From Swiss-Prot:
Effect of residue 155 to D: In Cerulean; leads to improved quantum yield, a higher extinction coefficient and is 2.5-fold brighter than ECFP
Consequence the record notes for mutating residue 205 to S: In EBFP1.2; shifts the excitation and emission spectra to shorter wavelengths and increases quantum yields compared to BFP
Function: Energy-transfer acceptor. Its role is to transduce the blue chemiluminescence of the protein aequorin into green fluorescent light by energy transfer. Fluoresces in vivo upon receiving energy from the Ca(2+)-activated photoprotein aequorin.
Species in which this protein is naturally found: Aequorea victoria
Protein name per the record: Green fluorescent protein
Length: 245
């Protein structure tokens, strides 16, 4: 499965936390242009397959932004890192003490989200606790006016070390689909730093490939999102000629 047999006992440590299926809890407090809301999510992750199954509920009533815009905010430690890349998995190496994930998300010709989250274990549960603040949105625009399709395009994201902060940085573009066929750009700037003073794995340049399916629970009356998300790491070659010349 496995995830223990690596020559590197540091890799062994992190992988052992992510053997098997791990329960996940997500909590978000949000405030966008003064529209306050809370989201709770539950489900499970299987990092061997880079696989997340999560259901999110807006516990304060109607969500005042479109669900797709919160996908990246609402646990990269469940990404599948190839065996030959496991020395580059920052996210698992920061566990169980965890890491801070901070972003600014710029919606082109509209407002911005600023997010701070702490991702860590509480017992056997991987917890993602988030604060989100949104300002400068158009109250009748694509976000506050709910003009986005309920879907999520597949995309690739580059990850780099931020060696001076003992963590990583990443910037990438999300393109949300507008209901008229156009696109709403959401430009992401991201940084992650460990919560402990313990050692972490700082990665060589690489990327994560993502795909997400969004659906609804037909017996759920609350405003909600069902997410099936896969994240896989790539972009570093083996070696040694390769193995297949």
């Amino acid at each position: 499965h496995h995830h223990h047999h690596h020559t590197d006992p540091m890799v062994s440590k992190g992988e052992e936390l992510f053997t098997g299926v791990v329960p996940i809890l997500v909590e978000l407090d949000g405030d966008v242009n003064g529209h306050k809301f809370s989201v709770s999510g539950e489900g499970e992750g299987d990092a061997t397959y880079g696989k997340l199954t999560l259901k999110f509920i807006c516990t304060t009533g109607k969500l005042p932004v479109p669900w797709p815009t919160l996908v990246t905010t609402l646990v990269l430690c469940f990404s599948r890192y190839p065996d030959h890349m496991k020395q580059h998995d920052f996210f698992k190496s920061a566990m169980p003490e965890g890491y801070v994930q901070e972003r600014t998300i710029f919606f082109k010709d509209d407002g911005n989200y600023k997010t701070r989250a702490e991702v860590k274990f509480e017992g056997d549960t991987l917890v993602n606790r988030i604060e989100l603040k949104g300002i400068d949105f158009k109250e009748d625009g694509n976000i506050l006016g709910h003009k986005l399709e309920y879907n999520y395009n597949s995309h690739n994201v580059y990850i780099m070390a931020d060696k001076q902060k003992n963590g990583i940085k990443s910037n990438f573009k999300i393109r949300h689909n507008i209901e008229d066929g156009s696109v709403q750009l959401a430009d992401h700037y991201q940084q992650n730093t460990p919560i402990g003073d313990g050692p972490v794995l700082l990665p060589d340049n690489h990327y994560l490939s993502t795909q997400s399916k969004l659906s609804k629970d037909p017996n759920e009356k609350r405003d909600h999102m069902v997410l099936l998300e896969f994240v896989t790491a790539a972009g570093i070659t083996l070696g040694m000629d390769e193995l297949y010349k």
